[PDB]
Design a protein around this ligand. Structure first.
Ligand SMILES: Nc1ncnc2c1ncn2[C@@H]1O[C@H](COP(=O)(O)OP(=O)(O)OP(=O)(O)O)[C@@H](O)[C@H]1O
Ligand SMILES: [Cl-]
Ligand SMILES: [Mg+2]
Length: 300
């Protein structure tokens, strides 16, 4: 019979990237890069965002690939964001069909048609990539921004370095706790709209909302993490690197109130699980944790 710690560590391992998934991400990168280089001047590409920080939850969706545009494409830098995104969109629809391709704020999503079963298993295949037109300006990158109509600065290496620093200060448990809350945020039980938008905001908040080092127990850490996220979701959350626009403006007021309510509900659901465990009702506690997170949380 599983202890609470044993169950959380199994959950954590189920959310870790493995070698077969990595090989699949690399293969999709080759496929999309080789194609896009026939349509645009692209010097190089790279896997980035949460995928590269080991903070992307499962199943693996919306893996960012920056496609670094050559000087021959510099005309795009002085044009509206929708122009380069339109061109990337049309190219990718031509190859993958309209149903598979979706415009996003700072990327085009390509969905490979990989089946996600009800247990969140894909036979070790990535679900989709976010294709990002990008210019390397020297100090950082610039990518298209639908909200402003223009281009914004981003340095994913600052995000990576600070995720690594938080993780080292948290006894190597920070990244896993982030992936667990992102798994909860993705739970179909919440409906069509996730509690927190974008998912990246959970990680930005966690840089401040996990603190004091690792406390030693997953269940208390998760409870307090949810409670802190509820209390702070209305704060301003700038780009931590100080380069791009704030991360906290994608939710309108009603959406943020809902975010706070669902995060607080999660903190209460976690408290119930903690109370079960305190009283020796261990299979009851595991059932409470599974109802909160979803099927990847184990009962045995
Ligand atoms: N406002 C911003 N300013 C600068 N960089 C940003 C901004 N928003 C996002 N980023 C960078 O772009 C990356 C991709 O954003 P995206 O929303 O696609 O999430 P992601 O990395 O896939 O994370 P998740 O798995 O949580 O969705 C981020 O991880 C971050 O490095
Ligand atoms: Cl959403
Ligand atoms: Mg993404």
């Amino acid at each position: 019979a599983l202890s609470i710690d044993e169950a959380f560590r199994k959950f954590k391992s189920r959310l870790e990237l493995n070698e077969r998934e990595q090989k699949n991400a690399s293969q999709r990168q080759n496929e999309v890069r080789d194609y896009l280089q026939t349509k645009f001047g692209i010097a190089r590409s790279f896997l980035t965002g949460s995928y590269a920080r080991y903070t992307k939850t499962k199943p693996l969706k919306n893996i960012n690939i920056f496609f670094v545009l050559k000087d021959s494409e510099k005309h795009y830098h002085g044009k509206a964001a929708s122009v380069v995104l339109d061109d990337f969109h049309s190219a990718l629809v031509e190859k993958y069909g309209s149903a598979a391709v979706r415009k996003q704020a700072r990327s085009i999503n390509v969905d490979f048609g990989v089946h996600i079963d009800a247990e969140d298993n894909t036979d070790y295949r990535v679900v989709s990539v976010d294709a990002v037109p990008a210019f390397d300006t020297g100090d950082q990158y610039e990518i298209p921004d639908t909200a402003s109509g223009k281009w914004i600065k981003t340095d994913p290496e600052i995000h990576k370095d600070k995720a690594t620093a938080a993780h080292q200060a948290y006894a190597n448990e920070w990244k896993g706790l982030v992936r667990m809350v992102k798994y909860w945020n993705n739970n179909p039980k919440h409906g069509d709209l996730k509690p927190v938008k974008p998912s990246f905001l959970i990680e930005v908040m966690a840089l401040e909302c996990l603190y004091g080092g690792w406390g030693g127990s997953f269940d208390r850490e998760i409870q307090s993490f949810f409670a802190t996220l509820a209390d702070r979701v209305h704060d301003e959350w700038p780009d931590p690197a100080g380069l791009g626009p704030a991360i906290s403006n994608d939710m309108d007021a009603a959406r943020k109130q809902r975010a706070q309510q669902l995060l607080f509900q999660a903190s209460q659901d976690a408290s119930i699980a903690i109370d079960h465990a305190r009283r020796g009702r261990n299979i009851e506690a595991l059932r409470a944790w599974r109802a909160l997170f979803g099927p990847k949380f184990p009962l045995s």
